[PDB]
Design a protein around this motif. Structure first.
Motif, PDB file in Angstrom:
ATOM      1  N   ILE A 152      -0.706 -10.051  -6.804  1.00  0.00           N
ATOM      2  CA  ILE A 152       0.591  -9.498  -6.457  1.00  0.00           C
ATOM      3  C   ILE A 152       0.375  -8.296  -5.537  1.00  0.00           C
ATOM      4  O   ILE A 152      -0.377  -7.391  -5.877  1.00  0.00           O
ATOM      5  CB  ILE A 152       1.498  -9.170  -7.686  1.00  0.00           C
ATOM      6  CG1 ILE A 152       2.826  -8.515  -7.244  1.00  0.00           C
ATOM      7  CG2 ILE A 152       0.780  -8.311  -8.717  1.00  0.00           C
ATOM      8  CD1 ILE A 152       3.934  -8.539  -8.258  1.00  0.00           C
ATOM      9  N   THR A 153       1.000  -8.300  -4.367  1.00  0.00           N
ATOM     10  CA  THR A 153       0.940  -7.179  -3.430  1.00  0.00           C
ATOM     11  C   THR A 153       2.367  -6.680  -3.233  1.00  0.00           C
ATOM     12  O   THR A 153       3.260  -7.475  -2.942  1.00  0.00           O
ATOM     13  CB  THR A 153       0.296  -7.596  -2.109  1.00  0.00           C
ATOM     14  OG1 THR A 153      -0.953  -8.210  -2.401  1.00  0.00           O
ATOM     15  CG2 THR A 153       0.086  -6.420  -1.172  1.00  0.00           C
ATOM     16  N   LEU A 154       2.597  -5.388  -3.447  1.00  0.00           N
ATOM     17  CA  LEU A 154       3.940  -4.832  -3.370  1.00  0.00           C
ATOM     18  C   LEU A 154       4.002  -3.546  -2.546  1.00  0.00           C
ATOM     19  O   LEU A 154       3.321  -2.578  -2.870  1.00  0.00           O
ATOM     20  CB  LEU A 154       4.451  -4.588  -4.805  1.00  0.00           C
ATOM     21  CG  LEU A 154       5.944  -4.309  -4.994  1.00  0.00           C
ATOM     22  CD1 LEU A 154       6.823  -5.397  -4.325  1.00  0.00           C
ATOM     23  CD2 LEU A 154       6.302  -4.192  -6.478  1.00  0.00           C
ATOM     24  N   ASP A 155       4.822  -3.538  -1.485  1.00  0.00           N
ATOM     25  CA  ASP A 155       5.094  -2.368  -0.653  1.00  0.00           C
ATOM     26  C   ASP A 155       6.354  -1.687  -1.175  1.00  0.00           C
ATOM     27  O   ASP A 155       7.328  -2.366  -1.505  1.00  0.00           O
ATOM     28  CB  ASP A 155       5.359  -2.779   0.796  1.00  0.00           C
ATOM     29  CG  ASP A 155       4.124  -3.072   1.617  1.00  0.00           C
ATOM     30  OD1 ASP A 155       3.007  -2.804   1.126  1.00  0.00           O
ATOM     31  OD2 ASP A 155       4.276  -3.554   2.758  1.00  0.00           O
ATOM     32  N   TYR A 156       6.352  -0.353  -1.221  1.00  0.00           N
ATOM     33  CA  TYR A 156       7.476   0.436  -1.708  1.00  0.00           C
ATOM     34  C   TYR A 156       8.092   1.180  -0.518  1.00  0.00           C
ATOM     35  O   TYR A 156       7.496   2.110   0.014  1.00  0.00           O
ATOM     36  CB  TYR A 156       6.996   1.416  -2.799  1.00  0.00           C
ATOM     37  CG  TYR A 156       6.610   0.754  -4.109  1.00  0.00           C
ATOM     38  CD1 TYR A 156       5.394   0.101  -4.253  1.00  0.00           C
ATOM     39  CD2 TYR A 156       7.425   0.861  -5.230  1.00  0.00           C
ATOM     40  CE1 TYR A 156       5.038  -0.505  -5.452  1.00  0.00           C
ATOM     41  CE2 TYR A 156       7.081   0.257  -6.433  1.00  0.00           C
ATOM     42  CZ  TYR A 156       5.890  -0.431  -6.541  1.00  0.00           C
ATOM     43  OH  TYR A 156       5.545  -0.990  -7.754  1.00  0.00           O
ATOM     44  N   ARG A 157       9.260   0.747  -0.075  1.00  0.00           N
ATOM     45  CA  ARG A 157       9.929   1.329   1.085  1.00  0.00           C
ATOM     46  C   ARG A 157      10.931   2.408   0.722  1.00  0.00           C
ATOM     47  O   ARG A 157      11.105   3.366   1.473  1.00  0.00           O
ATOM     48  CB  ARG A 157      10.667   0.222   1.854  1.00  0.00           C
ATOM     49  CG  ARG A 157      11.207   0.663   3.203  1.00  0.00           C
ATOM     50  CD  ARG A 157      11.782  -0.506   3.956  1.00  0.00           C
ATOM     51  NE  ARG A 157      11.561  -0.416   5.401  1.00  0.00           N
ATOM     52  CZ  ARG A 157      10.471  -0.861   6.021  1.00  0.00           C
ATOM     53  NH1 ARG A 157       9.476  -1.407   5.327  1.00  0.00           N
ATOM     54  NH2 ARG A 157      10.357  -0.746   7.337  1.00  0.00           N
ATOM     55  N   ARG A 158      11.628   2.229  -0.401  1.00  0.00           N
ATOM     56  CA  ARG A 158      12.704   3.120  -0.791  1.00  0.00           C
ATOM     57  C   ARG A 158      12.892   3.099  -2.286  1.00  0.00           C
ATOM     58  O   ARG A 158      12.704   2.071  -2.928  1.00  0.00           O
ATOM     59  CB  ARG A 158      13.991   2.627  -0.118  1.00  0.00           C
ATOM     60  CG  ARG A 158      15.128   3.615  -0.112  1.00  0.00           C
ATOM     61  CD  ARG A 158      16.203   3.145   0.834  1.00  0.00           C
ATOM     62  NE  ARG A 158      15.760   3.228   2.230  1.00  0.00           N
ATOM     63  CZ  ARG A 158      15.899   4.306   2.995  1.00  0.00           C
ATOM     64  NH1 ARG A 158      16.493   5.395   2.521  1.00  0.00           N
ATOM     65  NH2 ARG A 158      15.458   4.299   4.245  1.00  0.00           N
ATOM     66  N   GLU A 159      13.305   4.219  -2.835  1.00  0.00           N
ATOM     67  CA  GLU A 159      13.528   4.359  -4.260  1.00  0.00           C
ATOM     68  C   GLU A 159      14.919   3.790  -4.705  1.00  0.00           C
ATOM     69  O   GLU A 159      15.888   3.859  -3.958  1.00  0.00           O
ATOM     70  CB  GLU A 159      13.298   5.837  -4.629  1.00  0.00           C
ATOM     71  CG  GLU A 159      13.987   6.331  -5.881  1.00  0.00           C
ATOM     72  CD  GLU A 159      13.301   7.531  -6.501  1.00  0.00           C
ATOM     73  OE1 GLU A 159      14.008   8.497  -6.871  1.00  0.00           O
ATOM     74  OE2 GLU A 159      12.055   7.500  -6.621  1.00  0.00           O
ATOM     75  N   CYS A 160      14.986   3.172  -5.898  1.00  0.00           N
ATOM     76  CA  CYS A 160      16.228   2.626  -6.437  1.00  0.00           C
ATOM     77  C   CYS A 160      16.780   3.686  -7.394  1.00  0.00           C
ATOM     78  O   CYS A 160      16.061   4.158  -8.271  1.00  0.00           O
ATOM     79  CB  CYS A 160      15.975   1.293  -7.146  1.00  0.00           C
ATOM     80  SG  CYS A 160      17.399   0.629  -8.063  1.00  0.00           S
ATOM     81  N   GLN A 161      18.016   4.134  -7.160  1.00  0.00           N
ATOM     82  CA  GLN A 161      18.645   5.123  -8.025  1.00  0.00           C
ATOM     83  C   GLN A 161      19.123   4.470  -9.333  1.00  0.00           C
ATOM     84  O   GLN A 161      19.280   3.252  -9.401  1.00  0.00           O
ATOM     85  CB  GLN A 161      19.822   5.796  -7.307  1.00  0.00           C
ATOM     86  CG  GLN A 161      19.553   7.253  -6.963  1.00  0.00           C
ATOM     87  CD  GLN A 161      18.791   7.441  -5.690  1.00  0.00           C
ATOM     88  OE1 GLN A 161      17.563   7.383  -5.688  1.00  0.00           O
ATOM     89  NE2 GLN A 161      19.499   7.722  -4.595  1.00  0.00           N
ATOM     90  N   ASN A 180      11.904  -2.925  -1.442  1.00  0.00           N
ATOM     91  CA  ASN A 180      10.541  -3.447  -1.590  1.00  0.00           C
ATOM     92  C   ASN A 180      10.383  -4.770  -0.884  1.00  0.00           C
ATOM     93  O   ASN A 180      11.333  -5.536  -0.778  1.00  0.00           O
ATOM     94  CB  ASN A 180      10.209  -3.759  -3.075  1.00  0.00           C
ATOM     95  CG  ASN A 180       9.978  -2.581  -3.948  1.00  0.00           C
ATOM     96  OD1 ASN A 180      10.903  -2.099  -4.583  1.00  0.00           O
ATOM     97  ND2 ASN A 180       8.747  -2.096  -4.005  1.00  0.00           N
ATOM     98  N   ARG A 181       9.156  -5.070  -0.498  1.00  0.00           N
ATOM     99  CA  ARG A 181       8.725  -6.363   0.009  1.00  0.00           C
ATOM    100  C   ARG A 181       7.338  -6.664  -0.603  1.00  0.00           C
ATOM    101  O   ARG A 181       6.577  -5.736  -0.925  1.00  0.00           O
ATOM    102  CB  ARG A 181       8.729  -6.424   1.543  1.00  0.00           C
ATOM    103  CG  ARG A 181       7.654  -5.607   2.223  1.00  0.00           C
ATOM    104  CD  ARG A 181       7.652  -5.870   3.720  1.00  0.00           C
ATOM    105  NE  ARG A 181       8.849  -5.353   4.392  1.00  0.00           N
ATOM    106  CZ  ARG A 181       9.067  -5.438   5.704  1.00  0.00           C
ATOM    107  NH1 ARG A 181       8.186  -6.038   6.493  1.00  0.00           N
ATOM    108  NH2 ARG A 181      10.177  -4.936   6.233  1.00  0.00           N
ATOM    109  N   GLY A 182       7.038  -7.939  -0.822  1.00  0.00           N
ATOM    110  CA  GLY A 182       5.755  -8.301  -1.415  1.00  0.00           C
ATOM    111  C   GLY A 182       5.378  -9.751  -1.336  1.00  0.00           C
ATOM    112  O   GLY A 182       6.088 -10.539  -0.731  1.00  0.00           O
ATOM    113  N   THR A 183       4.219 -10.087  -1.919  1.00  0.00           N
ATOM    114  CA  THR A 183       3.682 -11.448  -1.988  1.00  0.00           C
ATOM    115  C   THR A 183       3.050 -11.674  -3.346  1.00  0.00           C
ATOM    116  O   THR A 183       2.498 -10.742  -3.941  1.00  0.00           O
ATOM    117  CB  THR A 183       2.582 -11.718  -0.916  1.00  0.00           C
ATOM    118  OG1 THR A 183       1.585 -10.699  -0.982  1.00  0.00           O
ATOM    119  CG2 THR A 183       3.126 -11.829   0.497  1.00  0.00           C
TER     120      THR A 183
END
Ligand code: A1BNE
Ligand code: A1BNE
Lengths: 268, 269
Positions: free
Chosen positions: B219-228, B260-263
């Motif tokens: 699992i690869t996960l990019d964190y772009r923005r926080e979820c309130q 988020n975006r991931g694979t």
């Protein structure tokens, strides 16, 4: 963890984890409820019962019978801090043909003082038809040898909060959290919603201001019906008063009741 | 847990709990991600850093600076069973002025064999404005004395999965889970959504049949923005492929703002 000297109760120590604490740097009530469930599972394993959350005997397995929670009652005096060690002692007692009871005592491992206590009522049911039934002699003989014979109550008091009748919340509810759905983390090994998720769902309709200025002292929860993986829940709360609340969990669609309960909160 | 002999890494053992396992009687990927986060926090405590999940220092605290996750990469070979002991070793390394990296090695405490590994990229950010910044020398000097100086990589391989670029999922998505909201159990001590919740949210759009017949390998996960706490998320998945590969996207239910975006890579049981 391990069974005590007489083999009639079980003890276990837990160190509070970083992700287990809330906005006050202390364990949440759901972390507490998870630890009680873990020590209960470990007690069932140590004496040869099933470990899937149903504490099933070889007789119950052939007959497709499982133990299910009907009521959970938790009272916390001090929530352990992150890094603290909490020791939990648990035992079971037969309540004749009505069912079974599991009790817990929570202590500070360093001071030895009682920081909380819990009680739960379990009932026997068929896993497929969901029909409740009285406990037969053949199944009592299998679990009574693991219970103290003289009564040992975590809530001994005559007229205590653990045995109080809970009314059904009247519409309109003062507060509500709508559209609650379980995810895969909310499911157990048998793909059923964990009993702890219902506690979290009940607390979601409590306003953030109450959570921020008060601490949860008592929670009583009745379990009427299971929530499926594809079900959607509505959480309803009304102030009945220290602050007291009356709670109701029902299916988002038909309004079918799944839980009812009460909470008591103290000012910090 | 405790720092190793040289004080340049941290180890901890965990016994898998009853409520931490899935339908296979083994630990879920979210239980694994929670344990990596717990051992990371214990390593920061043991060397005097802040413990709120930001591993701060008096200098960062003065300037309102926090460390935030930009990428998480996890590869599991064997998921521990309930009752099994898993030993996790963790360390940090400086990546110059880009930021830091935290690596993990998971082992079976009984056999000693590597059962999983993880890597994460962290970036320096102002708490209030949310603006990223390159690590200054004054900050670098405070944490370098706790890092091995020679490179020590959990994923050393030259073209490995942990450094692959992730594309943005195109509409329409093959699969989706709509209306996901965090509850109080999903929040940390600072009232922010836990990084592990995003992993669960990503996996919610994977069909139950895939979960039932396959095991999650990578699992690869990019964190772009926080979820309130009051935000609503949509989880989107598309099959990109014995092995199954998926492309993922988490976006806000309303405006479609990417969080988020991931694979993921799964193998047949
Ligand atoms: C539902 N809890 C009670 C059942 C039966 O009696 C038991 C006795 C000792 C350990 C576990 C036990 O599991
Ligand atoms: C964002 N994680 C890295 C920071 C800085 O370097 C560190 C070194 C050792 C323990 C914790 C550490 O926290």
């Amino acid at each position: 963890g391990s069974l005590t000297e007489d083999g009639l109760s079980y003890k276990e120590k837990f160190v509070v984890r970083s992700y287990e604490v809330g906005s006050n740097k202390t364990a949440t009530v759901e972390t507490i409820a998870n630890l009680l469930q873990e020590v209960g599972c470990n007690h069932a394993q140590s004496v040869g019962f099933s470990t899937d959350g149903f504490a099933t005997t070889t007789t119950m397995r052939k007959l497709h019978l499982i133990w299910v929670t009907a009521r959970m009652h938790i009272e916390i005096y001090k929530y352990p801090a992150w890094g603290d060690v909490v020791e939990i002692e648990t035992w079971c007692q037969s309540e004749g043909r009505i069912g079974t009871r599991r009790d817990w005592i929570l202590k500070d491992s360093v001071t030895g003082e009682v920081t909380g206590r819990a009680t739960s009522k379990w009932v026997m049911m068929n896993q497929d038809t969901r029909r409740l039934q009285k406990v037969s002699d053949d199944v009592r003989d299998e679990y009574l040898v693991f219970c103290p014979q003289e009564p040992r109550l975590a809530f001994p008091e005559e007229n205590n909060r653990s045995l109080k009748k809970i009314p059904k919340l009247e519409d309109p509810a003062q507060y509500s959290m709508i559209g609650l759905k379980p995810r895969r983390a909310d499911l157990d090994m048998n793909q059923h919603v964990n009993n702890v998720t219902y506690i979290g769902w009940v607390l979601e309709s409590i306003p953030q201001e109450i959570v921020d200025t008060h601490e949860l002292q008592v929670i009583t929860l009745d379990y009427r019906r299971e929530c499926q993986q594809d079900d959607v829940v509505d959480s309803l709360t009304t102030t009945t008063s220290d602050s007291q609340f009356l709670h109701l969990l029902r299916l988002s669609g038909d309004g079918q009741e799944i839980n009812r309960g009460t909470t008591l909160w103290r000012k910090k």
